[model samples]
Target: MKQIEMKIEEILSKIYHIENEIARIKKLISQKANSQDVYNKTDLYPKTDLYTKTEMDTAMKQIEWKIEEILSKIYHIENEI
Candidate 1:
C-alpha cells in the first residue's frame, strides 16, 4: 500500500516535469510567433522558422497522454488496495 503510494508520487513528479516542459515549449512557440505577423490569415502567414509546431504539438499530446496513462494505473492500484 505504502509502496504504491510512493510509486504514484514518483509518477506525479515525472508528470510535473512533463507539464513544465510543455509549458516552456508553448512559451517558446508563442515568442516565435510574436516576432512575426501572427494575425495574418492568408498564404503569406509566417510560420515559426525556429521549430515545427506540428512536432511540438505531437510531443505535448504524447506527454499528456503518458500522464493520463500513469494516473489511470494509479487509480487501478488504489482500487485494488
Candidate 2:
C-alpha cells in the first residue's frame, strides 16, 4: 500500500470541514435585491440587505475555490503514489 493513501484520507477530512463552513455561511445568508434606473452593471454596487447576500455568495464562491485547489493538489500527490 502506498503511504500516499494516508495523505488522501487526511485531505478528505479537510474538505469536509471546509464544506461545513460554507454551509454555515449559507444559513447566515438565508436571512434575507433590486431595480436600477440610473447605473451600469459593473459599477453600480447594488444592495440586498447587501452584506448578507454579497457576503454569502462571494464567500461561498471563495470557499468552493479552495476546495477545488485542494482537490487538484491531492490529485497530483495521489498520482505520485
Candidate 3:
C-alpha cells in the first residue's frame, strides 16, 4: 500500500482511541446531576441541562477537524509520490 494510505490508517487508529475516550466521558457524565459536586474540584460533572449538548458538539467538531487534517496530509503525500 502507499505510504499515504498507511498514514491514514494511523489516523483512523488514533480516532478509535478518541472514540473510547468519548464513551468514557459519556459514561462519567451520565451518572451525576449538573449541580452536584463530587468534592471540591467543582466544574467536572456533565450538566445534562447545560453542558451535555456542548460536550457532544465539541467532540464531533474535534473529530471533524482531525479527519480533515489526516485527509489533507494524505492527499499531499500522494501527489508527491
Candidate 4:
C-alpha cells in the first residue's frame, strides 16, 4: 500500500509537468502578438528563411498533440484515483 501511494505521487508530479506544458502551448496559440511578421520564436509567422511553413505547421501540431495527451492523462488519473 505504501508503494502504491508513492506511485500515485509520482504520477501526480508527472501530471503537473504535463499540465504546465499544455498551458504553455495554449498560451502560445492564443498570443495574437505572435502574428507579427518578425522572425522570432515568439512570432507565430516566423520568417520563411528561418523556418519553412511546413516546419512551423508540424511544431504547432506537436503542441496540439501534447495538449491532448495531457488532457487524456488527467482523465485517466482521475479515473484511477
Candidate 5:
C-alpha cells in the first residue's frame, strides 16, 4: 500500500516535467503573421528555430502522440497492487 502511494507521487512528478516539456515546444511553433503582401515558402515564417512547416507538422504529431501515449500509460500504472 505504501509503495503504491509512493509510486503515484513519483509519477505525478514525472507528469509535471512532461507538461513543462510540452509548454516549451509551444513557443517553437508559436508565431504571429507579419506584413504579407505575398507569403512564400522561403519567408521568415520558417525562421523560428529554423523548423520548416513539415517538421513542425512532425513535431506536432509527436507531441500529440506523447500526450495520448502518456494517458495510455496510466492504465498500466493502475495495474499495480
Candidate 6:
C-alpha cells in the first residue's frame, strides 16, 4: 500500500509537469496565432507578407498537431493513474 501511494505520487508529479508543458505550448500557439493575424492585416503587409500563407498554415498545423499529441499522452497517463 505504501509503495502504491508512492507510485501515485510519482504519477501526480508527472501529470503536473505535463500540464505545465501544455500551458507553455498553448502560450506559444497563441503568440503564433496573433502574429499570423498581424501578418494578415494590412499596413504592415510588407513586413508580414515575408512568409506565404502556405508556410504559415503548415507551421501552425504542426504546432497544433503537437499539442494534440501531447494532450493525448496526458489523458492516457491520467487515465492510467
Residue 70's lDDT within candidate 2 is: 93
Error in Å for residue 21 of model 4: 0.6
Residue pairs that clash (backbone atoms under 3 angstroms), model 3: none
Q: Give the poorly placed runs of model 6, Cα more than 4 Å off.
A: 33-81
Highest TM-score model number: 6
Writing each residue's lDDT as its tens digit, candidate 2 over 1-81 gives 577999899999999999999999888866532234445667656674357766789879989999999999998999999
TM-score computed on alpha carbons, candidate 5: 0.37
Name the runs in model 3 displaced over 4 angstroms.
36-81
- Whole-model Cα lDDT of every candidate shown, in order: 0.83, 0.81, 0.84, 0.85, 0.82, 0.85
| TM-scores for every candidate against the unseen true structure | 0.39, 0.36, 0.40, 0.38, 0.37, 0.41
- Model 4 agreement with the true structure over 1-81: per-residue lDDT tens digits: 999999999999999999999999999878766545456665445455576778889879989998999999999899999
66 Cα displacement, candidate 2 (Å): 72
TM-score-wise, the better of 4 and 6 is 6
lDDT, model 1, position 35: 32
Off by over 4 Å in 2: 32-81
Per-residue lDDT of model 5, residues 1-81, tens digit only: 999999999999999999998988786646645555566776645566577789989989978988999888998889973
Worst 10 residues of 3 by lDDT: 36-45
**Ten contiguous residues minimizing lDDT sum, candidate 5:** 29-38
Off by over 4 Å in 1: 33-81
Question: What are the C-alpha RMSDs, in order, of all predicted structures?
Answer: 34.3, 34.7, 33.6, 33.1, 33.8, 32.0
Better of 1 and 2 by lDDT: 1
Residue by residue across 1-81, what tens digits does model 3's lDDT show? 699999999999999999999999999989877754444445545454465767889979989998999999999999999
